[PDB]
Amino acid sequence: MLTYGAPFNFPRWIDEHAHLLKPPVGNRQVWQDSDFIVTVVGGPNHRTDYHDDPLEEFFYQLRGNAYLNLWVDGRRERADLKEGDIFLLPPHVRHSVQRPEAGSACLVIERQRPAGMLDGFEWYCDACGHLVHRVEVQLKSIVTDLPPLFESFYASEDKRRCPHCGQVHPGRAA
């Protein structure tokens, strides 16, 4: 009843999964069907969507650097995950994680969401900073519940059009 296997060396597990910690794939979840979702995230990867997590997110940047674009107190903000940094993100703080560096590796820990506890994914207008669009999801598996969400935002000018100025968000790349 060691459901998740025995202890294993983390530095070598990362090395052996280097090929998955780059595009297209970029991340890799360590254990399946656990309440703690433990993930190593590589790079490079940039993104425009902001995440509204209904629970906390723990970060430990083992290798290389990254940063988070944030909305805090109503203003845009960057928080830097220099190598060796740890960070706890409180629920519902909008965050957009940028990972410019190949060969980087960040341990990210989250919890399964209970039924009815929803995640949100939002884009904002580069022009007027207004909320451009938001999907809420019952997040079960990032691999099938998230890609289609981004794809459908990039494909629809109607979803990218700011409802306050009319600027059509550029979609995938800022």
Nearer to Fe ion, 15 or 164 (CB): 164
As measured in angstroms, the least distance from the Cβ of 18 to Fe ion is 23
Task: Write the residues followed by a gap in the chain (C–N more than 2.5 A).
Answer: none
As measured in angstroms, the least distance from the Cβ of 97 to Fe ion is 7
Element (H, E) at 147: helix 147-154
Please give the single-letter amino acid code of residue 155. A
Residue 158, SS3? helix
Q: Is 137 in the site for Fe ion (CB under 5 A)?
A: no
Nearer to Fe ion, 7 or 90 (CB): 90
Nearer to Fe ion, 51 or 133 (CB): 51
Structure tokens at 4: 């998740």
Nearer to Fe ion, 140 or 164 (CB): 164
Residue 160 known to bind ligand: no
Nearer to Fe ion, 78 or 130 (CB): 130
Of the residues 130, 140, 147, 156, which one makes contact with Fe ion according to CB under 5 A: 130
Q: Binding to Fe ion (CB under 5 A): which residues in 110-129? A: 125, 127-128
Cβ 144 vs Cβ 137: under 8 Å: no
Cβ 93 vs Cβ 122: under 8 Å: no
How many binding residues for Fe ion (CB under 5 A)? 10
Q: Binding to Fe ion (CB under 5 A): which residues in 16-75? A: 51, 53
As measured in angstroms, the least distance from the Cβ of 13 to Fe ion is 22
> Beta strands of 34-139 (E only): which ranges?
36-41, 50-52, 57-63, 66-72, 75-81, 86-89, 95-98, 105-111, 119-124, 131-137
Rg (CA), the chain: 17
Binding residues for Fe cation: 51, 57, 95, 125, 128, 162, 165
Query: Interface residues with Fe ion (CB under 5 A)?
Result: 51, 53, 125, 127-128, 130, 162, 164-165, 167
